[PDB]
Amino acid sequence: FEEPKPNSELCCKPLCLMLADESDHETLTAILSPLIAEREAMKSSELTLEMGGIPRTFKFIFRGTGYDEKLVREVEGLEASGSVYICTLCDTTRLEASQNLVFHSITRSHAENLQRYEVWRSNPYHESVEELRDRVKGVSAKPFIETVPSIDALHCDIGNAAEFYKIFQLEIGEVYKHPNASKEERKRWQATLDKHLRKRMNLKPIMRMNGNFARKLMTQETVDAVCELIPSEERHEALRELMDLYLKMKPVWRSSCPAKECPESLCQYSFNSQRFAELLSTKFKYRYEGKITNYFHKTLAHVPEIIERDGSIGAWASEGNQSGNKLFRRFRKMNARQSKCYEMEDVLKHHWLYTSKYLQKFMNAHNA
Amino acid sequence: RRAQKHRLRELKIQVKEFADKEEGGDVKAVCLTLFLLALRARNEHRQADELEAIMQGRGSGLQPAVCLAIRVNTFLSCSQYHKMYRTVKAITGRQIFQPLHALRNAEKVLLPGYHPFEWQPPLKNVSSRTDVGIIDGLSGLASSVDEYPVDTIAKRFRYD
Amino acid sequence: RRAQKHRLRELKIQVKEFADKEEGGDVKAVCLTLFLLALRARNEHRQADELEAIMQGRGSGLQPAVCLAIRVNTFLSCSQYHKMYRTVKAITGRQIFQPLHALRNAEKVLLPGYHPFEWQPPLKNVSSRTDVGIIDGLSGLASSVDEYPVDTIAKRFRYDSALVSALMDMEEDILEGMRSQDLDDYLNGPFTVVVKESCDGMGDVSEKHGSGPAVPEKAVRFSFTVMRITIEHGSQNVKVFEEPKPNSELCCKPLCLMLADESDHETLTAILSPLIAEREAMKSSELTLEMGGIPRTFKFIFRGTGYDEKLVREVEGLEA
Amino acid sequence: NQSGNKLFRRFRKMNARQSKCYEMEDVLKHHWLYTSKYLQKFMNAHN
DNA sequence: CACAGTGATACAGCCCTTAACAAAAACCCG
DNA sequence: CACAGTGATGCAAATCAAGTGTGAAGCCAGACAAAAACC
Ligand SMILES: [Ca+2]
Ligand SMILES: [Zn+2]
Q: Residue by residue, what is the 3-state secondary structure of A247-261?
A: HHHHHHCCCCCCCCC
Beta-bridge partners for B117: A49
* CB < 8 Å to B65, chain A: 358-359, 362
Residues C93 and C174: their CA atoms lie apart, in Å, by 41
Q: Which chains touch A (3 or more CB pairs under 8 A)?
A: B, C
Backbone phi, psi, residue B6, to 5°: -75, -5
DSSP alpha helix (H) spans, C170-287: 171-179, 266-282
| Contact between residue B54 and residue C47 where contact means Cβ atoms under 8 Å apart | yes
Instruction: Give residue B156's identity as a one-letter amino acid code.
Output: R
Q: Is C219 helix (H, G, I), strand (E, B) or coil?
A: strand
| Contact between residue A20 and residue A28 where contact means Cβ atoms under 8 Å apart | yes
Look up residue C123 and give its DSSP letter: P
Residues C303 and A126: their CA atoms lie apart, in Å, by 85
Backbone phi, psi, residue A161, to 5°: -70, -40
| Contact between residue C226 and residue C303 where contact means Cβ atoms under 8 Å apart | no
Would you say C49 is a known binding-site residue? no
Look up residue C221 and give its DSSP letter: E
Closest residue to C92, CB basis, from B47, B54, B62: B62
Instruction: Give residue A339's identity as a one-letter amino acid code.
Output: S
Closest residue on chain C to D25 (Cα): C155
Q: Which of B86, A346, B90, D10 is nearest to C75 (CA)?
A: D10
Backbone phi, psi, residue A57, to 5°: -115, 135
Tell how far CA B37 is from the center of its chain: 32
| Contact between residue B13 and residue C11 where contact means Cβ atoms under 8 Å apart | no
Residues A153 and A319: their CA atoms lie apart, in Å, by 8
Which distant-in-sequence residues (6+ apart) come within 8 Å of C146 by Cβ? none
B104 touches chain D (CB under 8 A): no
Q: Which of A173, A167, A161, A244 is nearest to A206 (CA)?
A: A161
Q: Residue C217: how many CB atoms within 10 A of its CB?
A: 14
* Buried-exposed string B71-107: b where 16+ CB fall within 10 A, e elsewhere: bbbbbbeeebbbbbbbbbeeebeeebbbebebbeebb
Tell how far CA A85 is from the center of its chain: 17
Asked if the Cβ–Cβ distance from A362 to B121 is below 8 Å, we say no
∠ CA C98-C104-C109, nearest 5°, is 110
Closest residue to D35, CB basis, from C199, C205, C253: C253
Nucleotide nearest to A337 (CA to C1'): F6
Closest residue on chain D to C78 (Cα): D15
Find the A317 Cα to ligand 2 centroid distance in Å.
18
> Do the bridges between strand C287-290 and strand C117-119 make them parallel or antiparallel, or are there none, so unpaired?
antiparallel
Residues B100 and B85: their CA atoms lie apart, in Å, by 9
> Do the bridges between strand C218-232 and strand C190-203 make them parallel or antiparallel, or are there none, so unpaired?
antiparallel
| Contact between residue A258 and residue A307 where contact means Cβ atoms under 8 Å apart | yes
Which distant-in-sequence residues (6+ apart) come within 8 Å of C77 by Cβ? D14, D15
Q: Using alpha carbons, list the distances in angstroms from residue A239 to A172, A235, A251, B136.
A: 11, 6, 19, 55
Nucleotide nearest to C73 (CA to C1'): F4
Residues C97 and B91: their CA atoms lie apart, in Å, by 13
Backbone phi, psi, residue D41, to 5°: -75, -10
When scoring B128, B135, B159, B160 by the number of chain A Cβ atoms within 10 A, the one with the most, hence best to mutate, is B159
When scoring A195, A198, A203, A204 by the number of chain C Cβ atoms within 10 A, the one with the most, hence best to mutate, is A204
Which distant-in-sequence residues (6+ apart) come within 8 Å of B103 by Cβ? B64, B67, B68, B71
Q: Which of C270, C274, C269, C267 is nearest to C124 (CA)?
A: C274
Dihedral of the CA atoms C22, C27, C33, C34 (nearest 10)? 80
Helix %, strand %, coil % of chain D (to 5): 65, 0, 35
Backbone phi, psi, residue A235, to 5°: -70, -30
Burial class (CB in 10 A: 0-12, 13-18, 19+), B56: exposed
Which distant-in-sequence residues (6+ apart) come within 8 Å of C117 by Cβ? C130, C160, C164, C287, C288, C289
Beta-bridge partners for A55: A50
Beta-bridge partners for A263: none
Q: Is C78 helix (H, G, I), strand (E, B) or coil?
A: helix
Please, which residues 190-229 of chain C have a Cβ atom closer than 8 Å to chain D?
198-200, 202, 205, 208-212, 215, 219, 221, 223
Q: Which of C66, A350, A338 is nearest to B68 (CA)?
A: A350
Q: Residue A237: how many CB atoms within 10 A of its CB?
A: 12
Q: State the nearest Cα–Cα gap between C181 and chain B, in angstroms.
A: 29
Q: Which of B72, B82, B75 is nearest to B111 (CA)?
A: B72
**Strand (E) or helix (H) holding C199:** strand C190-203
Nearest-CA residue relative to C1' of F3: C248
Q: Using alpha carbons, list the distances in angstroms from residue A346 to A111, A288, B112, B153.
A: 38, 50, 14, 13
Residues C95 and C83: their CA atoms lie apart, in Å, by 13
**Strand (E) or helix (H) holding C264:** none
B147 touches chain A (CB under 8 A): no
Q: Residue C1: how many CB atoms within 10 A of its CB?
A: 9
Q: State the nearest Cα–Cα gap between C35 and chain B, in angstroms.
A: 6
Q: Is B110 helix (H, G, I), strand (E, B) or coil?
A: coil
Closest residue to A19, CB basis, from B73, B134, B153: B153
* Buried-exposed string C119-135: b where 16+ CB fall within 10 A, e elsewhere: eeeebeebeeeeeebbb
Q: Using alpha carbons, list the distances in angstroms from residue B76 to A264, A354, B67.
A: 46, 11, 11
Instruction: Give residue A294's identity as a one-letter amino acid code.
Output: N
B145 touches chain D (CB under 8 A): no
Backbone phi, psi, residue C189, to 5°: -65, 160
Backbone phi, psi, residue A106, to 5°: -75, 125
| Contact between residue A300 and residue A102 where contact means Cβ atoms under 8 Å apart | yes
Nucleotide nearest to B38 (CA to C1'): E16
∠ CA A49-A40-A146, nearest 5°, is 130
Closest residue to A363, CB basis, from C87, C210, C214: C87
Instruction: Give residue C134's identity as a one-letter amino acid code.
Output: I
Residues B12 and B57: their CA atoms lie apart, in Å, by 28
| Contact between residue D37 and residue C165 where contact means Cβ atoms under 8 Å apart | no
- B35 CB-side CA count, 13 A: 23
Asked if the Cβ–Cβ distance from C254 to D35 is below 8 Å, we say yes
Number of residues assigned to chain A: 368
C6 CA from E26 C1′ (Å)? 17
> Do the bridges between strand C190-203 and strand C302-306 make them parallel or antiparallel, or are there none, so unpaired?
parallel
Nucleotides of E under 7 A from a protein CB: 1-9, 15-17
Which distant-in-sequence residues (6+ apart) come within 8 Å of C87 by Cβ? A362, A363, A365, A366, B66, B70
**Strand (E) or helix (H) holding C52:** helix C45-55
Asked if the Cβ–Cβ distance from B156 to A348 is below 8 Å, we say yes
Experimental method: cryo-EM
DSSP alpha helix (H) spans, C98-221: 100-107, 159-169, 171-179
CB pairs under 8 A between B and C: 146
Instruction: Give residue A5's identity as a one-letter amino acid code.
Output: K
B126 CA from E8 C1′ (Å)? 56
Asked if the Cβ–Cβ distance from D45 to B83 is below 8 Å, we say no
Cis peptide preceding A14, ω within 30 of 0: no
Residues B103 and B111: their CA atoms lie apart, in Å, by 13
Q: Which of C156, C163, C68 is nearest to C115 (CA)?
A: C163
Asked if the Cβ–Cβ distance from C221 to D29 is below 8 Å, we say no
B9 CA from F39 C1′ (Å)? 28
Q: Which residues touch strand F (CB under 7 A)?
A: A 333-338, 346, 349; B 1, 77-80, 83, 101, 104; C 37, 40-41, 43, 45, 245-250; D 2-3
Closest residue on chain A to C85 (Cα): A363
Q: Which of C179, C221, C182, C230 is nearest to C200 (CA)?
A: C221
Residues B1 and C39: their CA atoms lie apart, in Å, by 12
Closest residue on chain D to B85 (Cα): D43
The sign of the CA dihedral C274, C279, C285, C286 is positive
| Contact between residue C278 and residue C163 where contact means Cβ atoms under 8 Å apart | no
Tell how far CA A96 is from the center of its chain: 22
Residues D30 and D11: their CA atoms lie apart, in Å, by 8
Return the HEC string of chain A.
Answer: CCCCCCCCCCCCCCCEEECCCCCCHHHHHHHHHHHHHHHHHHCCCCEEEECCCCEEEECCCCCCCCCCHHHHHHHCCCCCCCCCECCCCCCCECCCCCCCCCCCCCCCCHHHHHHHHHHHHHCCCCCCHHHHHHHHCCCCCCCCCCCCCCCCHHHHHHHHHHHHHHHHHHHCCCCCCCCCCCHHHHHHHHHHHHHHHHHHHCCCCCCCCCCHHHHHHCCCHHHHHHHCCCCCCHHHHHHHHHHHHHHHHHHHCCCCCCCCCCHHHHHCHHHHHHHHHHHHHHHCCCCCCCCCCHHHHHHHHCHHHHHHHHCCCCCCCCHHHHHHHHHHHHHHHHCCCCCCCCHHHHHHHHHHHHCCHHHCCCCCHHHC
* Buried-exposed string A286-301: b where 16+ CB fall within 10 A, e elsewhere: ebbeeebbbbbbbbbb
C223 CA from F22 C1′ (Å)? 68
Q: Residue B25: how many CB atoms within 10 A of its CB?
A: 11
Asked if the Cβ–Cβ distance from B37 to C95 is below 8 Å, we say no
Return the HEC string of C268-317.
Answer: HHHHHHHHHHHHHHHCCCCEEEECCCCEEEEECCEEEEECCHHHHHHHCC
Q: Is C240 helix (H, G, I), strand (E, B) or coil?
A: strand
- C71 CB-side CA count, 13 A: 29
